[PDB]
Design a protein around this ligand. Structure first.
Ligand SMILES: Nc1ncnc2c1ncn2[C@@H]1O[C@H](COP(=O)(O)OP(=O)(O)NP(=O)(O)O)[C@@H](O)[C@H]1O
Ligand SMILES: Nc1ncnc2c1ncn2[C@@H]1O[C@H](COP(=O)(O)OP(=O)(O)NP(=O)(O)O)[C@@H](O)[C@H]1O
Ligand SMILES: [Cl-]
Lengths: 334, 329
C-alpha cells in the first residue's frame, strides 16, 4: 500500500509565494505511485488549512491558496499517521521542527539545532572555524557588547578588516556595503535596531559557488554549480572550475554538513577568487527547492531526478525518526 | 484580576517523576491570590491532559497523574483569556516544546529555541563559550560515522591534544548516561563504544581535579547572578572561595547567559582548581527547579524566596512575549 505524506507550505513570511511555488513544484513531481499526499496551507495570518489526496497536476499557484493544528498533522486521509511531513516554509529558525518533534511526526530536512544553528551566522561561522574551513576575515559580536564597548569592536575592525566591508545581521534584508567607518557605524546602528547579533565580513571579489549535499549519517555531495549576475558577462551547472577545486569544494561541503550536524540536506555556498582561493560563506539548511532551484538542479546534474530526490528526502526523514526512537528506548532502558 | 498561568509537566522522558515532583513544588509555591492556575499533564505515552482551576495544595505526585487537542489546550485559559505565562517543567531540555509555543504564539517561561537547543548540544555550547573567550578544558568532538572510518586517527588525536584521564560524553544528552572517565586508550575505546549506544556525536574532554561550582542567573535584558555555590549531594552555598574568584564566576556566568542568547534563566556550572583556575563546564537552560534544587537555593541565599523566584520568572516571560508582539510587524 501507499505511504502517507503531508506537504506544509505558506507561512507568515515575505517568502509566502515562493513557498507556494515550491509546493506546486514538489506536488507536481512527488512519485504518486508511492505516496498518498495531503497538503496543509498556512495563511499569511497563520490559519492552518488542509486538503486531502492531491492527485491531479497543479496548473496554478492560485489553486494552492486554500479557501486545530494538532488535529491536522496527527492523521492522514487514509486514516493512518503520516510516514513523513515535508515542510516548505520564520519557519527557518527550527520552531516548526520542534512542533513536529512534540507531535512525534517524522519530518523532512534539518532538525531543531541544525536549523537554528544555520540561521545564526555567528554560531555557524564559529563552527566553520572549529572545522578549520577557510573564511574571509570577519568579526561577530552582540549588540549588548557594541552598546557598551564600541571602541573595542571598532578597534578589531581597524586591526582585522579592510574597506569595503559587509555588515550582516546574524539572524535576519539589512545587509550593507560600507566603504569607511562612518558608513560602518551607520550600518551597525541600523542592523542593531532589529537584530541583537552581527557579523562584519571583509569584502571580496569572487565567484559564488554552491554545492548540494544529501543524507543523514553518510552524506554525499554534488559537483559545484555557480550563481552569476549574467551568464553572458542565473545558474550555471556544473561550474567552470578546475577538477581539484571542485573536489576540494565537495569535501568542504561534506565537512560543513558534519560540523553543523545537518540532517537530510544542506547547500554550502563558497566564495572562489580568480586565483582559486576558496572561502566558505555559509550553509543553508533550507535551500530553495523549486523545480529550477540550485539545490535540485545540482542533483539533476548527478543523475538524481527531482522525483527521486523528493523520494530520497522522504526515506531519510523516516530513517531519522526511527533512529531517534531507538536511542530513546536505549536511554529509557539504561 | 489575577494573571493566568499554565504549568506543563510529565513527558516521554525517564525524568517523568522528577517533572511531576517539580510541578508539585511549583504549584504549592505559587501565589494563588495573584495567579489563576491550570495544568497540563503529558503522559509517558504522550497524551496531553488538562485540569483547570488549581486552588488547593497538591498532596501527592499520584494526584498529578491526570486521567482534547494540543493547540486548544495551550491557546485558551480557563479564565477565557490567553495565558500570561506557560511554565514548561518537562523533550523539554532541547528546544522542541519551545518551538511549539512559538508557533502557537504562547508566552512561556525560560529560554527560547536557540538557547535551549544549543545548551543540549555540548559541541555548539562549547563554540559559543570559545567565541566569547571563556576558559574551557581541551576537548575534541566527532560523529559515529567518523569514528568508524578514522578510529586510529581519533585515538591519536585524543592522546596528542588531551591529557589522560579524559571524560567521554554524548554531545546531545542531559543526564549522566554514557559518560565515563577513561584513564587510557583501552578504557577510552570502551567508553566511546558505550557512549555510542545513546548518541551519534561525542565530545571527549581532558579531565581535571576540581571543585564543581555553579552560578544562577535570572532576567532577560539585565540578568543578575547569585553568589556561587559548590556541589560536593550536599549543596554548599555560598561556595568557600576567595572574594575575587566569586566575582569572576558571577561575571563569566552573566557573559555565558548573554552569549548563549538566554531568556529568563540559566545555571552556569564551572570547574575551579585548588589554585583557582576556572573552566566553564556547561550552561543548563532548564536547571532542576524543586524547592531543594541548586538553582532556587542559590537565589534563597540572595534573599529571593522560591515563591518570588517563580513570580519573577513569570514576569520575565510576560515581558519577553510582550516584546515579541510589539515587534511582530
Ligand atoms: N564578503 C563579501 N564580499 C562581496 N560581496 C558580498 C560579501 N558578502 C555578501 N556579498 C553580496 O551580498 C549578497 C547577499 O548576501 P549573502 O551573505 O550571500 O546572503 P545569502 O543568504 O547567501 N543570499 P540572499 O539571502 O539571497 O541575499 C551576496 O550574494 C553577494 O552578492
Ligand atoms: N572534564 C572533567 N573533569 C573532571 N570531572 C568531570 C569532567 N567532566 C565531567 N566530570 C564529572 O562528571 C559529571 C558529569 O559531567 P557533565 O558535563 O556535568 O554532564 P551532565 O550530563 O550535566 N551530568 P550532571 O553534571 O550530574 O547534571 C560532572 O559533574 C563531574 O562530576
Ligand atoms: Cl530584565
Amino acid at each position: 500500500t501507499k505511504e502517507n505524506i503531508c506537504i506544509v507550505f505558506g507561512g507568515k513570511s515575505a517568502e509566502h509565494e515562493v513557498s507556494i511555488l515550491t509546493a506546486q513544484n514538489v506536488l507536481n513531481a512527488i512519485d504518486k505511485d508511492k505516496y498518498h499526499v495531503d497538503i496543509i496551507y498556512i495563511t499569511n495570518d497563520g490559519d492552518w488549512r488542509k486538503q486531502n489526496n492531491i492527485t491531479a497536476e497543479i496548473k496554478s499557484t492560485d489553486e494552492l491558496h486554500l479557501e486545530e493544528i494538532s488535529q491536522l498533522l496527527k492523521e492522514s486521509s487514509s486514516g493512518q499517521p503520516y510516514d513523513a511531513v515535508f515542510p516548505l516554509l520564520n519557519g527557518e529558525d527550527g520552531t516548526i521542527q520542534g512542533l513536529f518533534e512534540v507531535l512525534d511526526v517524522p519530518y523532512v530536512g534539518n532538525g531543531v539545532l541544525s536549523a537554528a544553528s544555520s540561521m545564526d551566522k555567528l554560531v555557524m561561522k564559529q563552527l566553520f572555524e572549529h572545522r578549520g574551513l577557510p573564511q574571509l576575515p570577519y568579526i561577530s559580536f552582540l549588540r549588548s557588547e557594541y552598546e557598551k564597548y564600541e571602541h573595542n569592536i571598532l578597534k578589531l575592525v581597524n586591526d582585522k578588516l579592510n574597506y569595503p566591508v559587509f555588515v550582516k545581521p546574524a539572524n535576519l534584508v539589512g545587509i550593507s556595503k560600507c566603504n569607511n567607518e562612518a558608513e560602518l557605524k551607520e550600518g551597525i546602528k541600523e542592523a542593531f535596531q532589529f537584530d541583537r547579533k552581527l557579523v562584519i565580513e571583509q569584502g571580496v571579489n569572487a565567484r559564488e559557488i554552491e554545492v548540494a549535499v544529501l543524507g543523514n549519517d553518510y552524506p554525499e555531495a554534488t559537483w559545484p554549480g555557480e550563481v552569476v549576475k549574467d551568464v553572458a558577462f542565473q545558474l550555471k551547472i556544473p561550474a567552470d572550475l578546475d577538477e581539484d577545486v571542485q573536489l576540494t569544494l565537495r569535501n568542504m561541503a561534506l565537512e560543513a554538513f558534519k560540523e553543523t550536524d545537518c540532517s537530510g540536506l544542506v547547500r554550502a555556498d563558497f566564495f572562489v577568487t580568480e586565483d582559486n582561493q576558496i572561502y566558505i560563506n555559509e550553509t543553508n539548511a533550507m535551500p530553495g527547492f523549486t523545480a529550477f532551484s540550485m539545490y535540485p538542479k545540482l542533483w539533476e546534474n548527478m543523475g538524481l531526478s527531482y522525483p527521486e530526490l523528493i523520494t530520497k528526502l522522504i526515506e531519510l526523514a523516516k530513517e531519522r525518526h526511527q533512529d531517534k526512537q531507538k536511542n530513546k528506548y536505549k536511554i529509557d532502558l539504561e
